[PDB]
Design a protein around this ligand. Structure first.
Ligand SMILES: Nc1ncnc2c1ncn2[C@@H]1O[C@H](COP(=O)(O)OP(=O)(O)O[C@H]2C[C@H](n3ccc(=O)[nH]c3=O)O[C@@H]2CO)[C@@H](O)[C@H]1O
Length: 124
């Protein structure tokens, strides 16, 4: 089916905007991208920069992955991001999220050939 690269774009990419859309961006975005279908995805990050800018991060600052792997990279520049965190009040299937806009360095895990992002590890 959909490649790991493809999944990363659907789960974390959103160039169409510049900042945290609205207070209900995560509620909408999380639902639109299919991350609340089988269970309220607890935490998810959408990045607002060109696909090219994000792909570029795979050749930037090599840093250790949270899982101990060495295939993670941190962006030299900060990027516009929107963090989506599940509210406690949240209730499957009515997954609810808090929306937080920030400008930070992202850390992603890359794999394959081409060497592209397949996992969002962290923002710092
Ligand atoms: N070093 C590495 N560590 C982990 N996985 C690695 C890897 N290198 C490659 N892979 C591969 O990527 C696939 C997709 O990764 P995930 O299933 O974690 O999907 P998300 O990033 O959407 O889901 C993750 C990231 C997201 N998250 C976490 C923190 C945050 O700031 N933002 C955010 O979006 O929350 C979820 C849990 O933390 C894996 O199956 C694996 O094969």
């Amino acid at each position: 089916k959909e490649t790991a690269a493809a999944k990363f774009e659907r789960q974390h990419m959103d160039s169409s905007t510049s900042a945290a859309s609205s207070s209900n961006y995560c509620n909408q975005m999380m639902k639109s991208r299919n991350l609340t279908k089988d269970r309220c995805k607890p935490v998810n990050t959408f990045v607002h920069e060109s696909l090219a800018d994000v792909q570029a991060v795979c050749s930037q600052k090599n840093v250790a992955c949270k899982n101990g792997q060495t295939n993670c990279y941190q962006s030299y520049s900060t990027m516009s991001i929107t963090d989506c965190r599940e509210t406690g009040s949240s209730k499957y299937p009515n997954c609810a999220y808090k929306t937080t806009q920030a400008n930070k360095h992202i850390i992603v895990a890359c794999e394959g050939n081409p060497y592209v992002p397949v996992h969002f590890d962290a923002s710092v």
